[PDB]
Amino acid sequence: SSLWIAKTGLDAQQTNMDVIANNLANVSTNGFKRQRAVFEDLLYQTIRQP
Amino acid sequence: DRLDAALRFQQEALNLRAQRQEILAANIANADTPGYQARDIDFASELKKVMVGVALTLTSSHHIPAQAVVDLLYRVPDQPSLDGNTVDMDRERTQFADNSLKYQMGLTVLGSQLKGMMNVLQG
Amino acid sequence: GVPGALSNQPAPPNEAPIATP
Amino acid sequence: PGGVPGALSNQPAPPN
Amino acid sequence: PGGVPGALSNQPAPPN
Amino acid sequence: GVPGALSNQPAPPNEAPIAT
Amino acid sequence: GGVPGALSNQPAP
Amino acid sequence: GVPGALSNQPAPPNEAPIATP
Amino acid sequence: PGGVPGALSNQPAPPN
Amino acid sequence: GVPGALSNQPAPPNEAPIATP
């Protein structure tokens, strides 16, 4: 249903939040490369063809 | 009496349904007692046992006639509570509704049998 | 066996200790 | 012999 | 020829 | 035909297409 | 037959 | 014309005009 | 005779 | 008489004055 779709959305933004928190915690670290999170949508479901 | 033999099965089923109904309602009432085990009876086996005694002999009028005077199985717990109470709401609520339905069905069948025996006689 | 069956034995007491004995 | 219901018997306490 | 009763045969089916 | 009346010929199979 | 009715006793007893 | 009674003549047609005329 | 029953008739309309 | 009983005379008129004379 839509519940899990939106739950996957919430899980992605939390992941992104964790990535940003890690990047901000390592501001003063010497020789740190910033982490950038990219997202992809999973398989599309076809119910009836055009 | 032959009349008893015809109505023995339904009467015993009705009485067993009433007893199990009382047991289930006791399980519901004691849901909050810590350490209470949920008890129940196996309807079919007890119905066999009841369906499958010796009135003392009275020699005269003064002689006093003989004076008259089920096994409970523990329910398997589903979730472990901390207070030791094994009564589950959903399971016994469904069993309670089912027992009510079966009691009504037994009443219907017994009433139909009695009504048939009556319309045989009416005339 | 199955949760909700009928057995002739009471379930063991439900103890939950806070520390390992 | 059931004991106290509700809050007291649903809190983790050491056995005595 | 009958068919599936209820939801399946009362929702707009695919063209072919 | 008037609805609720009686006719000797069956009604044609009805369809509800999505695209003409 | 293959399907027991809704108002039948637990096919799974 | 008492309400709820029976009269030989039919009731006049009612009208609800939004403006005046 | 009669017309559309319900919402459409019991709603004010321009005179015509 | 007691409330809800039957009397031989009407109850007096009911009036609520906003300001007493």
Next chain:
Amino acid sequence: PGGVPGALSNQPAPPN
């Protein structure tokens, strides 16, 4: 013998 049955007869009013 009667009057307005509601708000307009159950509110205090100055006398006439």
Next chain:
Amino acid sequence: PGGVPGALSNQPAPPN
């Protein structure tokens, strides 16, 4: 015998 029912008889009052 009885007294005020409800509010005035269900609050702690000084002895009198």
Next chain:
Amino acid sequence: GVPGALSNQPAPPNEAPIAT
């Protein structure tokens, strides 16, 4: 006796004093 049984003698009056 039992909290909901029947006795022939009236229950003693209950009073709630502010201080004892």
Next chain:
Amino acid sequence: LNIFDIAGSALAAQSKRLNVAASNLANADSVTGPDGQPYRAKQVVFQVDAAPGQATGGVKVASVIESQAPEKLVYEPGNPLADANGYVKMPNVDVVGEMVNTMSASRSYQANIEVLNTVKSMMLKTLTLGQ
């Protein structure tokens, strides 16, 4: 017919538990009673009431006990109720526990009500038997 007694006992017991929970909530911030002692939180004791020998039955409230949980101590030396160290005993009421007790007692109360309604209907219908 015993089911009326069983369910009525259940309703009475849950009412007693609810009243105890309400008393605990009312006096969570209470300082002293009619005497100089603090307010010790109350708890009912549920037992299985089987007047005959058939093991099970309804629930009965054997007693109302004061939880032996430790008393909260607040430092108030100007209060005449304070002890030698200037501490005052405030009750140990568990607010969340008592609210949960209120709601759970309410739900059990309704379940017993529904049981009583159903069995009353069945006992009314059994009088119709064959007539």
Next chain:
Amino acid sequence: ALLNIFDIAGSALAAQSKRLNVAASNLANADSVTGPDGQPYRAKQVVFQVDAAPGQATGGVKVASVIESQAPEKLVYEPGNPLADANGYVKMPNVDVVGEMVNTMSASRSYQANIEVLNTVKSMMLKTLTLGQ
């Protein structure tokens, strides 16, 4: 020929009970992930046919067979659950909850209608038995 109504309405009652049971089974397993064989639960539906042998004008209704519902399996991205796909696509049943609830309501209503038919038919049979008396 009022006796045939007994057979017709009894068959209808049994078929509607089977349909309601299948709908409830689908609804209760909407959240299932695994079957007894490890396969995902497939939503099932009954097939209604006219219970008429060749040459019989009109009969009741009968359940021909139970068939898997035609709908895409609901894909869920959970590649942490022990059951998964090559890409972590857990397959969940294609149960449409609204459809199952409406099916349950419809089955109950049709069942009750058939019960009314049976009741009034029995009343008429008793009358008829009181024809001349």
Next chain:
Amino acid sequence: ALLNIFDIAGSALAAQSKRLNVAASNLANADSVTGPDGQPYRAKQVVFQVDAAPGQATGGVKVASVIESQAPEKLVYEPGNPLADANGYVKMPNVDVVGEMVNTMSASRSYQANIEVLNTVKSMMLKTLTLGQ
């Protein structure tokens, strides 16, 4: 024992109750450092299987066992804790917050749907028994 619909819907209620209990236990232990002994709490999962049943087409839901999740345990650098390893990372449970709230909502709505199914069936059940009398 139970009627087939009663058994199916009651099994659904019990399964949803078990899932809700697992979700609540996970949400309670979200911040637990050590368990009964000294090992970290592991998020529990409940697996729904369809009761095979002789009918197969119709069957409720059973729960085989409660499994322990296999996910990277959260590591927090607290070398002073006695439970820290050689590197000093204490283990915190892998309980996700959003997933458990979604699970609680879904379990509640499945529970209520099965309750509605039972309530709908009941009236038909009680009305069946009037057929004979």
Next chain:
Amino acid sequence: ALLNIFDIAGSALAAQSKRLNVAASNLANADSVTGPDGQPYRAKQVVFQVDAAPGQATGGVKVASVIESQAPEKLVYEPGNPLADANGYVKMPNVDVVGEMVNTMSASRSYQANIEVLNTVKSMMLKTLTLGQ
């Protein structure tokens, strides 16, 4: 006409329906600025009185007339409005919203009471016909 109690309760039902209609009309037009004649909407009220002409004190209820309220209309300052007077004031309805809501609820309750009265009177008259079998 309607026997006796039949006529009494029917008159009561019609009168309470008229009162509820007046209340609904007042509630709907609480913000009307004008009518077809350019006059402001004045709150309407029904007049209830008994109808016991053939030598009785009690005969039911009838609505003598519908009357517009004399409570001062609400003046709002709006000089650009075509309906504004010389001082620039526009007259607006004197509807009491809370009064009309309470009137709706009370009319519904007494209407229901009269429904219960008529139904009971019918029952009693139905049993009367079986006097002495």
Next chain:
Amino acid sequence: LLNIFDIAGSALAAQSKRLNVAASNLANADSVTGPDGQPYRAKQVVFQVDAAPGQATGGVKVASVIESQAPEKLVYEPGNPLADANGYVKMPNVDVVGEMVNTMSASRSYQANIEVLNTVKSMMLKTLTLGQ
């Protein structure tokens, strides 16, 4: 067949038709296209007296189902394929409140007619035992 039975059955059919029209309209409050690409125009039933051989009083028959003539709503979506030269897509003129009230009133009329039919059937059942 029987007059009052004919009347009540025709009226039940008419009210069911009105309820179905209202439900279909409520479903299509937000519909943007049909099969041919034309906007969905709201439907409304026409009631007419069925007293063809029964003078001026009889049952009610649904003469026709007609598209409402209220102007179609217009939404500015110039990227929509259905948008005209001015960029306005036509959306249905279904009034939600009117349809809800129509559903409720049709349900009440349906129940009233069912009660009427039941009372009439009971009256004939009692008529069947005249003089006995």
Next chain:
Amino acid sequence: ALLNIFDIAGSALAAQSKRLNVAASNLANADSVTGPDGQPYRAKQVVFQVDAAPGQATGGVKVASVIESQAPEKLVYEPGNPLADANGYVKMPNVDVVGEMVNTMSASRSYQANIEVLNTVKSMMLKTLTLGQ
């Protein structure tokens, strides 16, 4: 005349209605500053007694009288108020709003309970009327 339980429940309904009316009056004028004669509005209460007749402490409730609370009236400071005393204090009602709300709820539920009792007794005696069929 009213017979037994009918009399008892009618008395209970009337007294609960009086209690609710007194509560509504107290809650409505909880902020009134003056009465018609310049005296403050003192909170009113009802006094319940047991009908009893002469020898039967088993009767309904009867409202002996409406008493006026003699608890000291609240004092507010307003030297400009004409009703202020020589010290400049205006008397204000001693209404406890929470108490009035709880009293309204209690009168409501007791009213409903006695209605149910009356209905049950009415049905019981209606069925008693057909003793011996």
Next chain:
Amino acid sequence: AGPRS
């Protein structure tokens, strides 16, 4: 005598 009966 207490609550004797």
